[PDB]
Design a protein around this ligand. Structure first.
Ligand code: HEM
Ligand SMILES: C=Cc1ccccc1
Ligand SMILES: [Cl-]
Length: 442
């Protein structure tokens, strides 16, 4: 029997559109969800979508025979730069499945072992930076985590060194990336087009240096350049290879920087959790450099990372459309092409799944993950359109956080007040700490 969806306050002909005129629209959508419940309609001139918050409804929306990935307004904009790269292609575009099949083997267990030494190269630069600070100096947490994650995808994925740790100023790639993208929220056209040229010359250099190289390679770039899809039998064409390089250099670092920064925020705010994870790191990381196998034994560090993704998943929403007319939850009829948005932070606060203490930071929720019902925990998206870089993000973050907890004690010296900046990702803006060295050599 059919139900009418709640809707938040309207503004005449503008409908709900003005609720999004805020620098924190995900946070404002979470509040609407606390007020309206598991589903609400959100209308704008010429548009409608439905925001989902409960596991009981999201488990249906994750049914791939009924719903496929939709390009959100944001992906539609990013598409101007990332083209039909993995993240911004429709599932039905030839190049989505070709590139999925060609690039999947770049995240196999054997590929992950291949990347480990270069992840260590970066993680050691981070540890050295902090070792080298003078007394009383502090650390800008998301700034340094972005330094780490950017350098990690450039080097592991492309054998390119952004050398972020030699810079106190942004890398010309990144800031060009940002102001070209903003320059479609006279003159700022030699400027926007200076930037696009920055992006294009970097992609050009990545490709050309690989070709001029006589070294054998099995990294991500090697797959883009040489791999053949077993289905079509075809390799990627030059145009799509370019889009994939841009896709992975951005998707491959921003969300991972967020996760690291929230995890450390939650550790400093919960000193018993911090002590338990530091104890694990001291017990397990018995050598000067961690090995692949040692990172795999950092069980509790990995539970910390999942509990940080539970509360602040750093790609906080994904969009879907109905493949055919269908009824959601036995209550809401949908027509072919109708859109749904999955509000992941709210899914992750569903008290029917997690119990009443949902706001508490408790990594022990992840002790027995087979206990979690289907579709309840979704920081990496859904189905065949789920994050292809999941294992890469979690290996890098477990390695790096384990090393941080081995080498330093941390102080929340400002009593930092959580302030979450929203871009394509989320981060704790302005988060700073002091790190006192434990004086353990590398
Ligand atoms: C903790 C860090 C990360 C988070 C939370 C995350 C989250 C997500 C989510 C939610 C999606 C689905 C997007 C949608 O449905 O519209 C996705 C897709 C994707 N991610 Fe990640 N991601 C992370 C790290 C990475 C890394 C390190 C890489 C690359 C190495 C990456 C590459 C991609 C790509 C290429 C897709 C598109 C996959 C496809 O549709 O075929 N991500 N991610
Ligand atoms: C970092 C992976 C990703 C890809 C698309 C949207 C948000 C995050
Ligand atoms: Cl529990």
């Amino acid at each position: 029997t059919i139900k009418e969806m709640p809707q938040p306050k309207t503004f005449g002909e503008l409908k709900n559109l003005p609720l999004l005129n805020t620098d924190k629209p995900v946070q404002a959508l979470m509040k609407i969800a606390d007020e309206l419940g598991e589903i609400f309609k959100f209308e704008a001139p010429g548009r409608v979508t439905r925001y989902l918050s409960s596991q009981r409804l999201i488990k249906e929306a994750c049914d791939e025979s009924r719903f496929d990935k939709n390009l959100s307004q944001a992906l539609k904009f990013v598409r101007d730069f990332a083209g039909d790269g993995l993240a911004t292609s429709w599932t039905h575009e030839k190049n989505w499945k070709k590139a999925h099949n060609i690039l999947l083997p770049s995240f196999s267990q054997q590929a992950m072992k291949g990347y480990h030494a270069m992840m260590v190269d970066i993680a050691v630069q981070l540890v050295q930076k902090w070792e080298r600070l003078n007394a009383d100096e502090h650390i800008e947490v998301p700034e340094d985590m972005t330094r780490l994650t950017l350098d990690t995808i450039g080097l592991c994925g492309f054998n390119y060194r952004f050398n972020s740790f030699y810079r106190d100023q942004p890398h010309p790639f990144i800031t060009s990336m940002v102001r070209a993208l903003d320059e479609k929220m006279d003159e700022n056209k030699r400027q926007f087009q200076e930037d696009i040229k920055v992006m294009n010359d970097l992609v050009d250099k990545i490709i050309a240096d690989r070709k001029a190289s006589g070294e054998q390679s099995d990294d991500l770039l090697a797959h883009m350049l040489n791999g053949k899809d077993p289905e079509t039998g075809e390799p990627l064409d030059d145009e799509n290879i370019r889009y994939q390089i841009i896709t992975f250099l951005i998707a491959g670092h921003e969300t991972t920087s967020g996760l690291l920064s929230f995890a450390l925020y939650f550790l400093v705010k919960n000193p018993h959790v911090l002590q338990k994870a530091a104890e694990e790191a001291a017990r397990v990381l018995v050598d000067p450099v961690p090995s692949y196998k040692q990172v795999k034994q950092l069980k509790y560090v990995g539970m910390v990372l999942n509990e940080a993704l539970r509360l602040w998943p750093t790609a906080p929403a994904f969009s879907l459309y109905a493949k055919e007319d269908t009824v959601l939850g036995g209550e809401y009829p949908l027509e072919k092409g109708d859109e749904l948005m999955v509000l992941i932070p709210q899914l992750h606060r569903d008290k029917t799944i997690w119990g009443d203490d949902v706001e508490e930071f408790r990594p022990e929720r992840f002790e027995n993950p087979s206990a979690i019902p289907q579709h309840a925990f979704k920081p990496f998206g859904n189905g065949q359109r789920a994050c292809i870089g999941q294992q890469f993000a979690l290996h890098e973050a477990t390695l790096v956080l384990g090393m941080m907890l081995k080498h330093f004690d941390f102080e929340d010296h400002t009593n930092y007040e959580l302030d979450i900046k929203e871009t394509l990702t989320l981060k704790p803006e302005g988060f700073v700490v002091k790190a006192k060295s434990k004086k353990i050599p590398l």
